[PDB]
Scaffold this active site. Structure first.
Site, short mmCIF file in Angstrom:
data_model
loop_
_atom_site.label_atom_id
_atom_site.label_comp_id
_atom_site.label_asym_id
_atom_site.label_seq_id
_atom_site.Cartn_x
_atom_site.Cartn_y
_atom_site.Cartn_z
N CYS A 277 68.03 -32.07 39.98
CA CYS A 277 66.92 -31.56 39.20
C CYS A 277 67.43 -30.86 37.94
CB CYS A 277 66.14 -30.61 40.09
SG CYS A 277 64.90 -29.58 39.29
N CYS B 43 65.93 -27.49 36.99
CA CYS B 43 66.37 -26.45 37.91
C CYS B 43 67.57 -25.66 37.37
CB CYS B 43 66.69 -27.05 39.29
SG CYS B 43 65.26 -27.74 40.16
#
Ligand SMILES: [Cu+2]
Length: 108
Positions: free
Chosen positions: A32, A35
């Protein structure tokens, strides 16, 4: 990372559900991209909010059971718990200022 609680399926109950006060849980995974910035912001938040907020991480690849239990659909997702109950959620990236707004909105 020094101020971030590392959570798993096996520590979630004790570290979040039985924790007094406010805990902000970051649902994330290595794949991700968004993230990554969230993590950098969270280190600063964890430092700045010491004593008022605990920050924690739950890797969804490694703890799919917890992710499923909380209906996580995409990452990053932030779950704010207060005294073991979900108080708020925010799905998707946001700025540090937006996160501070999100937290303020949840003050009793
Ligand atoms: Cu740290």
């Amino acid at each position: 990372s020094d101020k971030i609680i590392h959570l798993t399926d096996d520590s979630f109950d004790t570290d979040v559900l039985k924790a007094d006060g406010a805990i902000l849980v970051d649902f994330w995974a290595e794949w991700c991209g968004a993230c990554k910035m969230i993590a950098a912001i969270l280190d600063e938040i964890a430092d700045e909010y010491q004593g008022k907020l605990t920050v924690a991480k739950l890797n969804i690849d490694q703890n799919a059971g917890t992710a499923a239990k909380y209906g996580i659909r995409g990452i990053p997702t932030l779950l704010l718990f207060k005294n073991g109950e979900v108080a708020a959620t925010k799905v998707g990236a946001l700025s540090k200022g937006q996160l501070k707004e999100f937290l303020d909105a949840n003050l009793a």
